[PDB]
Amino acid sequence: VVSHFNDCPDSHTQFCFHGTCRFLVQEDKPACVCHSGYVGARCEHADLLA
């Protein structure tokens, strides 16, 4: 509550190649979400990586 994000990019955004980027500023905490039709945690690979 109260805590919210806005400025996603803070270097930690480099942990996400192909996925939503959200950085909780008030609580500096990186958090990315995968898009779709992809694999991995960072979402660097697109299918063919089960």
UniProtKB/Swiss-Prot annotation:
Residues 4-44 form the EGF-like domain. It is found in: Secreted, Extracellular space. Disulfide bonds join 8-21, 16-32, 34-43. It comes from the Eukaryota. Residues 1-50 are extracellular. This is Transforming growth factor alpha. It comes from Homo sapiens (Human). The chain holds residues 40 to 89 of 160 of the full protein.
